[PDB]
Amino acid sequence: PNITNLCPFGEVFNATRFASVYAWNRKRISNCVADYSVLYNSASFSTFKCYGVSPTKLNDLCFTNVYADSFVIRGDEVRQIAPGQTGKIADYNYKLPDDFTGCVIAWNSNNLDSKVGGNYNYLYRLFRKSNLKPFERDISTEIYQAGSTPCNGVEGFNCYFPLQSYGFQPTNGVGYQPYRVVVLSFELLHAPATVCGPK
């Protein structure tokens, strides 16, 4: 289809680098024809679930906005990029609403994201006083206070730094290998639709 204004899914999925999950990255998609054929034609998708819409129907639907959130987590953790999950990631890193509408796409990125003797570039949040509300982002690096004793900006007993690095050796079992995740969230307000499939 020869279109003039086409949504940048290419830019989202084919980015060279991806955010740490704690500091997940969001791109807004608006006022463009969304061709999801470029997702269908991927061989490489390990996970491709949609919530509230059939993946086979995306090219038929209009939305007010689409939001492309992206990040890197463990293979073991993709499970948590779903409505109503718990775990370090879902709880403290990236939470979806219980009534989420969108797709979660993930692929093994061992090839790009692991370095021999570890790639310590990728971080996730290990401690937080509460859980995240849906689509909340926490990038603060305040030393986590466990005890009733203040931490005074330094580390120690009951005073731990809230971010941990993933290992990411090339030799890790699939479960511990890095996966790149894209979360398309379809947003439907009482406004004109700006993002429509070609159908």
Partner: antibody, heavy 127, light 108 residues
Framework: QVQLVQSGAEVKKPGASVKVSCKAS????????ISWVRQAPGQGLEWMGW????????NYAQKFQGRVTMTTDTSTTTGYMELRRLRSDDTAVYYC????????????????????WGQGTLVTVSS | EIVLTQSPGTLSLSPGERATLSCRAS???????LAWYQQKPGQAPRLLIY???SRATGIPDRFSGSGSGTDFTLTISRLEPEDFAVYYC????????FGGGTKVEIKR
């Protein structure tokens, strides 16, 4: 089906300016930035710069910093490259290419390259 | 910046032979960033390989890219007559730069 078709060859006196056009077709114009590459006679390829067809941000080779100006016209899906203060040193073939190395919309780096290239435009700089 | 150096500048091989073109980065480059282009004489360059290893549309399978760190490799498994051309590597980890080129030449 995709085509970038460049303007005719130019002859320019040292000092002058040259503005080469690049007419894209057969694909969504603002989905991909335009890269320009020149090749002087008997030389390898040399990158000149990049432009977003979407927002008009540019990234120029440090070599051509204060000297080149890239623009696009969305209306007619043409890209433009204007090299000023020409020296004979700048006699080359000037290529435009559909760029998939940095994204048009969010200006970030992509896993890709220069997808399709123009036929080239020869610019001869001589007294 | 990052400099890419292709050696040799001319590689002389008989048709049918496996060609193994080299590209050396002046420092560690990301494998996602390295592309390969083919240029026949008096012709636009054309994209062969991106992201080190990914084949461009329509490019035949004999062409394959590999490598990481500082040393990358375009490989042609069996040189057909049309495969004799100049090949340029290209990185955009840090800015964008090309290699000086390697001519693959018909040995005779």
């Amino acid at each position: 089906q995709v085509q970038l078709v460049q303007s005719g060859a130019e002859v320019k006196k040292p000092g002058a300016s040259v503005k080469v056009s690049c007419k894209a077709s057969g694909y969504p114009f603002t989905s991909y930035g335009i890269s320009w590459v020149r090749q002087a006679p008997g030389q390898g390829l040399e990158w000149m710069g990049w432009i977003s067809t979407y927002n008009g941000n540019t990234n120029y080779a440090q070599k051509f910093q204060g000297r080149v100006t890239m623009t696009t016209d969305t209306s007619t899906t043409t890209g433009y490259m204007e090299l000023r203060r020409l020296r004979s040193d700048d006699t080359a073939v000037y290529y435009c290419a559909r760029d998939y190395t940095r994204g048009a919309w969010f200006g970030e780096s992509l896993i890709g390259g220069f997808d399709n290239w123009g036929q080239g435009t020869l610019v001869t700089v001589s007294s | 910046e990052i400099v890419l150096t292709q050696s040799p500048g001319t590689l002389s091989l008989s048709p049918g032979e496996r060609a193994t073109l080299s590209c050396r980065a002046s420092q560690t480059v990301s494998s996602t960033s390295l592309a390969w282009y083919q240029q026949k004489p008096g012709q636009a360059p054309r994209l062969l390989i991106y992201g080190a290893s990914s084949r461009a549309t329509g490019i035949p399978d004999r062409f394959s890219g590999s490598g990481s760190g500082t040393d990358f490799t375009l490989t042609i498994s069996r040189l057909e007559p049309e495969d004799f051309a100049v090949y340029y590597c290209q990185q955009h980890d840090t800015s964008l730069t090309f290699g000086g080129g390697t001519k693959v030449e018909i040995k005779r």
